[PDB]
Amino acid sequence: GDTPPGNVQSTFKKMYPKANGVAWSQDDGYYCANFAMNGFTKNVWFNVRGQWVMTLTDLVSLDRLTPTVYNAFVSGPYANWVVDNVTMVEFPKWQAIIVIKVGQDNVDIKYQLFYTPQGILLKTRNVSDMYDILGPSTFLA
């Protein structure tokens, strides 16, 4: 991967002092650190001032959700869909978002479901033919 700017690396090392195997890239002017920490894959993003802008943690499955978000999922329209991924998205200022990616056995349709921590389904997006679906363009623009 890329070599991050020193100021970005400095902040990252304070957040995640024990991280290893970190793969760095950039998109839309933000820098992303990809790595595993205590059993979970993380993508941690920074701006050019070395300030943390978001962290995305791959929770993988519905068992990792709070009851509140779980209960909302199982009572909503996608309750019986196949869950491909579950991502927790955290920010310095904005409220966290839980992104559940769902599909159906035997068809290629995929949606991202954007839930609040209180279990409100804010919006969904078809991501069947989309790439780069958890970057700055999704959350920071």
Structural method: X-ray
Question: Residue 94 forms beta bridges with which residues?
Answer: none
Q: Pull the structure tokens for residue 137.
A: 């363009």
- The answer to whether the beta carbons of residues 40 and 82 sit under 8 Å apart is no
Q: How many CB atoms lie within 10 A of CB 59?
A: 18
Q: 137, 130, 93, 134: which is closest to 114 by C-alpha? A: 134
- The answer to whether the beta carbons of residues 44 and 129 sit under 8 Å apart is no
Report how far residue 65's alpha carbon sits from residue 60's, in angstroms, rounded to the nearest whole number: 10
Question: Residue 112 forms beta bridges with which residues?
Answer: 101, 125
What is the identity of the amino acid at 28?
Answer: D
Break the chain into its structural domains and give their ranges.
1-141
Report how far residue 96's alpha carbon sits from residue 76's, in angstroms, rounded to the nearest whole number: 20
Report how far residue 141's alpha carbon sits from residue 112's, in angstroms, rounded to the nearest whole number: 18
CA distances from 96 to 4, 7, 23 (A): 26, 25, 24
Q: 18, 40, 22: which is closest to 31 by C-alpha? A: 22
Q: What is the DSSP letter of 17?
A: T
Q: Which residue has the tokens 């839930």?
A: 115
Q: Which residue has the tokens 């195997």?
A: 21
Q: Pull the structure tokens for residue 98.
A: 């839980």
Please state which CATH number belongs to domain 1-141: 3.10.450.360
- The answer to whether the beta carbons of residues 61 and 87 sit under 8 Å apart is no
Residue 8: exposure state from Cβ atoms within 10 A (0-12, 13-18, ≥19) = buried
CA distances from 3 to 24, 32, 77, 105, 140 (A): 7, 11, 43, 40, 23
The structure was resolved to a resolution in Å of 1.6
- The answer to whether the beta carbons of residues 12 and 3 sit under 8 Å apart is no
Can you point out the beta strands (E) in the chain?
Answer: 23-27, 30-37, 40-46, 52-58, 82-90, 97-104, 107-115, 121-126
CA distances from 82 to 59, 100, 128, 141 (A): 15, 10, 14, 29
